[PDB]
Design a binder for these strands. Sequence first.
RNA 1: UGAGAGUUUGAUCCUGGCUCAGGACGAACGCUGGCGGCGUGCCUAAUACAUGCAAGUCGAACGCUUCUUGGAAAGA
Length: 163
Amino acid sequence: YIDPKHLELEDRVVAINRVTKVVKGGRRLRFAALVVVGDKNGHVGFGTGKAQEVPEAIRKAIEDAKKNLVEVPMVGSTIPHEVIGVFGGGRILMKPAVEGSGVAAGGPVRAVLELAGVADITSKSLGSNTPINVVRATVEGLKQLKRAEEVAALRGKSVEEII
RNA sequence: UGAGAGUUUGAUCCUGGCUCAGGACGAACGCUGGCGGCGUGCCUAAUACAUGCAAGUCGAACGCUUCUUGGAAAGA
């Protein structure tokens, strides 16, 4: 839902692509932007925007992303279980990992996973490789992580009985 | 114990082919060079082969012959 902004943030301009539009005469080019934001503790989001010049565009996109933030429940610096998230061609697979192993995941999804404060994880893109839909599918995947406590409360019994 | 990138378009998403980054080898060739330790070396014509060796032994199974010390045994 609506998350405020009172914690530190981190930014990484993932990708930009000079985009044009034709009009009687020549062509006119804009520069979009694609930035995700996090605090490397378990809060992540991303945004976008476009402007005539690149610093302006990235400032816009930055200001955008800070209005979408997700939770990413973690346990011991690794996702709580296996998950699969799909959004319009974005197949993204994620599985837990061993301590101190290291993240093995493609570029665009690496930026998401890192800024969320993830230490050891594995993944594999499957299909789409657009720097946008991949990110959307990733975030959808993260939105699916269940949790021991949450399930303990949902189902009748209590945790350490759901083993 | 599961990482991706470039390329169709004025720019977009998708389907889609081609190419690249990793390893190994009875290896060959091109430039280049000190060694020690352990390994390996006709994949082609099961093509033709000069040369030297690569299977003999037993005198306590048996009769002979030549010697080196007219009969002597030993050794050869």
